[PDB]
Amino acid sequence: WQENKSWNAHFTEHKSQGVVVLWNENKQQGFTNNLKRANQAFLPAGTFKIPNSLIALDLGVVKDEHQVFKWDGQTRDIATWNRDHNLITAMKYSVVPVYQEFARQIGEARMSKMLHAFDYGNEDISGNVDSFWLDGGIRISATEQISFLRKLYHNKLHVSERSQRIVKQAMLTEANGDYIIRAKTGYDTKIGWWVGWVELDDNVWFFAMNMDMPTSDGLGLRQAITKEVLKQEKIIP
Amino acid sequence: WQENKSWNAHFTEHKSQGVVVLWNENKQQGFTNNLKRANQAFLPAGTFKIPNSLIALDLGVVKDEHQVFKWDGQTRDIATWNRDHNLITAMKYSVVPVYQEFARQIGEARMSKMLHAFDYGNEDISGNVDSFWLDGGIRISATEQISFLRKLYHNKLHVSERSQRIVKQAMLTEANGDYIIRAKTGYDTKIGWWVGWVELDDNVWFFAMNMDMPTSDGLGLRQAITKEVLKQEKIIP
Ligand SMILES: [Cl-]
């Protein structure tokens, strides 16, 4: 690990504070603007959708990325959530209710063993089985996110290869002639996250970032700041 | 099928001639600017990489999208081809030599049965086993491309689901918050192709286009014209 405090300007430029962590797969070297925050554990919030999805797929709770998860009929504040979804759209719109259902079907016991097998965060699911990642005991650091993602990238997680490929499909966020980004955002009403990786022709750059988000105002900076960092490091144009 | 001659302006705007074929999956309705050219069969050229890849994966010729295909040491005119590649980069750069090797390893017999099982084009592989798609007897129409792609999308082709998912990964071309495009280009030194699909939140639009390409000058119009059509039909913004 190498600390690059210069990356801090990206946060200050935006009257914000946080951490960005990068991992160069080819070189097995990591970078961050704050070695400490890089290791501060936080509630994963939406980013937990990645493991929740893997678990659901492996247990059959989710058949594939096409399967329809019919809306339960309860209108919620976020418009996009009040409709039928599939893994793809459920990830894109961060549809909590769908995932809460997955969690319930998964159940405490299977969830707990699964997170342990994944070596995910503090592996604690205390609280409601269908809300622990949002207001429970589970906590994960950015470096931890990276360790987890690297396993996923390489299909080394303790679930079927198929489940892993499907989740990676569902993580698709951006792609063009220069790179591909597979990631997941999160927001716990205090902290905002963006975790994933940038696929290049001959390398992969894993990333995990989090930042203070007192207001849903700046959710956009999660992606904005990260890219400024990627651009700065010449990972993307 | 519905014929929309208005789409012809897109070709004429560019001093070109060709065909664009669209298929609305949800509605099971197709559209094109020229019902006849839509059915004219042509050499698939690079677009054949899709089936070649599937076959290679299913037979073990290709392990996964990570496996390295070491350059044979013969310098070819196209710069990007003179290096080691993987399925991802091999598709992106349309690396003929890699695919020729796959074909040889696959062999005539297995190739022939595989294309028949796929119901691919005229299913004829006459010519060199490692060049038939470029200067041999195989021919496929745009509507035929679509039929083939629909099977792929739905994992209904006669190969493993895994092989199909991997190829679809390798077809990734573009993605953003509004759509995802999975496709493959082709060029036989007279005809240029772009085939694939546009994934939306609640629908999929398959597409296949081909156009006269006397010169490698206008290869760019394959994607340009198609998008103008997609935009026109309000499929993409
Ligand atoms: Cl993908």
Question: What DSSP letter does each residue of A100-162 carry, written as one string?
Answer: HHHHHHH-HHHHHHHHHHHT-TT----S-TTTHHHHSS--B-HHHHHHHHHHHHTT-SSS-HH
* CA B162–ligand 1 middle distance (angstroms): 13
**Separation CA B183–CA B50 (nearest Å):** 9
**Separation CA A83–CA A73 (nearest Å):** 8
The resolution in angstroms reads 1.7
Rounded to the nearest 10 degrees, the angle between the axes of helix B161-170 and helix B49-59 is 140
Strand partners, B168: none
Q: What type of residue is A15? A: K
Using beta carbons and an 8 Å cutoff, which residues of B are at the interface with A?
88-89, 92, 161-162, 165-166, 169, 172-177, 180, 201-202
Of B235, B225, B227, B232, which is closest to residue B16 (Cα–Cα)?
B225
Please name the method used to determine this structure: X-ray
Strands, E, within chain A: which ranges?
A: 2-3, 18-24, 29-32, 172-175, 180-187, 191-199, 204-212
Q: Which residue has the tokens 């240029």?
A: B192
Would you state the structure tokens that stand for residue A174, as one six-digit string?
């951006």
**Separation CA B9–CA B6 (nearest Å):** 6
Please report residues of B whose CB lies closer than 8 A to that of A202.
89
Q: What is the CATH number of the domain that holds A208?
A: 3.40.710.10
B180 → closest Cβ in A165, A172, A177: A172
**Separation CA A208–CA A198 (nearest Å):** 11
Could you give the C-alpha distances from B193 to A64, A132, A207, B22, in angstroms and in order? 31, 50, 36, 14
Would you state the structure tokens that stand for residue B77, as one six-digit string?
């005119």
Contact B162 A166 (CB under 8 A): no
**Separation CA A38–CA B74 (nearest Å):** 46
Please compute, for residue B23, the number of CA atoms within 13 A of its CA located in the half-sphere on the CB side. 21
Please report residues of A whose CB lies closer than 8 A to that of B88.
201
Q: What is the dihedral of CA B75, B77, B80, B84, to 10 degrees?
A: -20
Strand partners, B2: B31
- For residues B3 and B34, the answer to whether their CB atoms sit within 8 Å is yes
- In terms of CA atoms, which chain A residue is nearest residue B90? A201
Q: Which residue has the tokens 């603007």?
A: A33
Could you give the C-alpha distances from B73 to A184, B76, B82, in angstroms and in order? 41, 9, 7
User: What separation, in Å, do the N-terminal and C-terminal C-alpha atoms of chain A show?
Assistant: 24
* DSSP H or E run through A76: none
User: What separation, in Å, do the N-terminal and C-terminal C-alpha atoms of chain B show?
Assistant: 24
DSSP state of A126: -
Strands, E, within chain B: which ranges?
A: 2-3, 18-24, 29-32, 172-175, 180-187, 191-199, 204-212
Would you state the structure tokens that stand for residue A55, as one six-digit string?
């678990």
**Separation CA B42–CA A234 (nearest Å):** 42
Q: Which residue has the tokens 């919030």?
A: A45
Q: How many domains does chain B have?
A: 1
Using beta carbons and an 8 Å cutoff, which residues of A are at the interface with B?
88-89, 92, 161-162, 165-166, 169, 172-177, 180, 201-202
- In terms of CA atoms, which chain A residue is nearest residue B181? A175
Domain with B196 in it? 1-237
B175 → closest Cβ in A162, A172, A202: A172
* DSSP H or E run through A3: strand A2-3
